[PDB]
Amino acid sequence: FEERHLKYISQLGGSVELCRYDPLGDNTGALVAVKQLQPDQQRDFQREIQILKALHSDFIVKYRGVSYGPLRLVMEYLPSGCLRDFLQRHRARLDASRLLLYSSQICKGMEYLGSRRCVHRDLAARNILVESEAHVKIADFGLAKLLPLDKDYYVVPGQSPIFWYAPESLSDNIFSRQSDVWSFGVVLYELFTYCDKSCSPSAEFLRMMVPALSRLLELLEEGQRLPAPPACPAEVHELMKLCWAPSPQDRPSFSALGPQLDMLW
Ligand SMILES: *CCC(=O)Nc1cccc(CNc2c(C(N)=O)cnn3cccc23)c1
C-alpha cells in the first residue's frame, strides 16, 4: 500500500483514519481503516501489527497489510461502525435473539483469541464493530498482549474506564483470559441495556459507589454487582453473574459460554 495512494477522508478512532486506497486517483478505489502513531510507543505499535496479521477469524477485524512511503497498519473498513452506537440507533429493531447472536459471535471470537494466547484487555461494546445486521467483529488491539508459553497471566496502571476491569486488574494489574471473561460479562450487560447511557456501567456503578478505583473495588469485594438490565431474560443475567465470579478460576471459559449462548439462540 503506497502512502501516496492512501487518500484521507476523516477520523474514526494513536489514531485510526478512514482513507481510500485510490491507485487510479479517480475516487473509485476501496475504503480502508488505517492506524498510525501520532520510542516505546513504536514497540507497542509493531506488536499490534504482528498480533493482528496472525489472527484469522470471521469474528476479528481483518488485517489488510502495512503502508510504505517517504509505517501504518491497514485494515478493513466496516461502515456501520461500533456496536455501542449501532445498538442505541437500532434499539426498536433488535430483539433478545439478535442480542444473543451478537453475544455468541463475540464469544467465538474471544475463544479464538485465547487459543492464540492473546489477552485483549479492552473488551467493551464501544470496541466491537458491526459487519452487517447479523455479523459483529472484535476490534481495537492497541492494548493486546501475548501470554508466554510458561505463563497464564500478565502483570502490567490502566487508562481505560474502570467499569470493565476484573477486581484482580483493579487491585494488582493482573490480566489474563479470565479477566477478559469478566469484561465479557460487562459486554452482555451493555448488549441487554442496548448501550443505554442512563443505565450504562459508568452511570449505574457511580450511583452505587478514598479514591474512586478503591470505592469500586470495595463494592466488588463485598459481592455487589450491576443489576439485571430492564426486561433482561434471567438465563442471560445468570451468565453475567457467572463471568463476575470473584476468583478468576471460578469464571466460565469462552468455550464453556459458547454452547450456553447458542442454546438460548
Ligand atoms: C463507538 C465509537 C467508535 O467508533 N469506536 C471504535 C471502536 C473500535 C475501533 C474504532 C476505529 N476503527 C475502525 C476500524 C478498524 N479497522 O479499526 C474499521 N472500521 N471502522 C468503522 C468505524 C471505526 C472503525 C472505533
Rounded CA separation 258/255 (Å): 5
Q: Domain end: 77, 98, 120, which one?
A: 77
Hey, what's the torsion of the CAs at 161, 54, 41, 30, to 10 degrees?
-90
State how far the alpha carbon of 248 is from the alpha carbons of 153, 155, 174, 218, 253, in Å: 10, 15, 10, 17, 10
CA distance 232 to 67: 45
Separation CA 160–CA 73 (nearest Å): 22
Distance of CA 8 to the CA centre of its chain: 26
What CATH number has the domain bearing residue 8? 3.30.200.20
Residues 6+ away with beta carbon under 8 Å from 190: 84, 87, 124, 125, 200, 201
Contacts (Cβ under 8 Å, ≥6 apart) of 16? 33, 34, 35
Q: What is the DSSP letter of 170?
A: H
Q: Which residues contact 233 (CB under 8 A, 6 or more apart)?
A: 96, 192, 264
Do 145 and 17 share a domain, yes or no? no
Looking at the fold, whether 61 and 94 belong to one and the same domain comes out as: no
> What share of residues in the chain are helix, strand, coil (percent, to 5)?
45, 20, 40
Q: Does the annotation flag 114 for ligand binding?
A: no
Active site residue 44: no
Q: How far is the CA of 139 from the centre of ligand 1 (A)?
A: 7
C-alpha cell at 168: 484482580
The verdict on whether residue 14 carries a ligand-binding annotation is: yes
With vertex at residue 75, the alpha carbon angle to CA 144 and CA 21, rounded to the nearest 5 degrees, is 155
Instruction: Say yes or no: 206 and 88 in one domain.
Output: yes
Instruction: Tally the domains of the chain.
Output: 2
Q: Are residues 157 and 173 in the same domain?
A: yes
**Do 130 and 243 share a domain, yes or no?**
yes
Cα separation, 107 vs 113, whole angstroms: 10
Catalytic residue among 122, 172, 180, 262: 122
CA of 235 to the centre of ligand 1 (A): 31
State the Cα angle at 61 between 59 and 65, rounded to 5°: 140
205: Cα separation from own chain's centroid? 20
Determine the residue of 129, 143, 195 to mutate for testing ligand 1's pocket, defined as the one with the most ligand atoms within 8 A of the Cβ atom: 129
In a shared domain, residues 174 and 72: no
Residue 66, CA atoms < 13 Å, CB-side half-sphere: 10
C-alpha cell at 53: 496479521
- Of the three residues 77, 107, 133, the one that is the final residue of a domain is 77
**Run of H or E residues at 146:** strand 145-146
Question: What backbone torsions phi and psi does residue 33 show, to the nearest 5 degrees?
Answer: -105, 125
User: Residue 66 pairs with which residues in a beta bridge?
Assistant: 73
Range of the domain at 29: 1-77
Q: Which residues contact 206 (CB under 8 A, 6 or more apart)?
A: none
Residue type, 180: D
Residues 248 and 204 grouped into a single domain:
yes
Residue 91 DSSP label: T
Rounded CA-CA distance 49/188 in Å is 28
Whether residue 95 is found in the same domain as residue 202: yes
Query: Does residue 180 share a domain with residue 262?
Result: yes
Residue numbers after which the chain is interrupted (C to N above 2.5 A) read 13, 38, 70, 156, 209
Dist. CA 95–CA 117, nearest whole Å = 33
Q: What's the reported resolution, in angstroms, to a tenth?
A: 2.5
Both 234 and 113 in one domain: the answer is yes
- Residue 27 φ/ψ, nearest 5 degrees: 75, 30
CA distances from 199 to 80, 129, 175, 190, 237 (A): 24, 22, 27, 9, 15
Contact predicate 246/167, CB 8 Å: yes
Nearest alpha carbon to residue 127 among 108, 141, 144, 117 = 141
Helix (H, G, I), strand (E, B) or coil at 31: strand
Q: Solved how? A: X-ray
Contact 75, 34 (CB under 8 A): yes
Which of 1, 103, 99, 114 is closest to 57 using CA atoms?
A: 114
Same domain, residue pair 217 and 101:
yes
Cα angle 228-97-135, degrees, rounded to a multiple of 5: 110
From the alpha carbon of 62, which atom of ligand 1 is closest?
A: 16
Residue 128 grid coordinates: 466491537
User: What is the CB neighbour count within 10 angstroms for residue 171?
Assistant: 14
* Local structure of residue 2 (DSSP, 8 states): B
Q: 62-94 burial by CB neighbour count: b if 16+ within 10 A, else e?
A: bbbeebeeeebbbbbbbebebbbebbeeeeeeb
Domain boundary among 23, 44, 77: 77
Q: What is the CATH number of the domain that holds 107?
A: 1.10.510.10
Say how many Å lie between the CA of residue 81 and the centre of ligand 1. Answer: 6
Asked if 77 and 18 count as a contact pair (C-beta separation under 8 A), the reply is yes
Whether residue 109 sits in one domain with residue 60: no
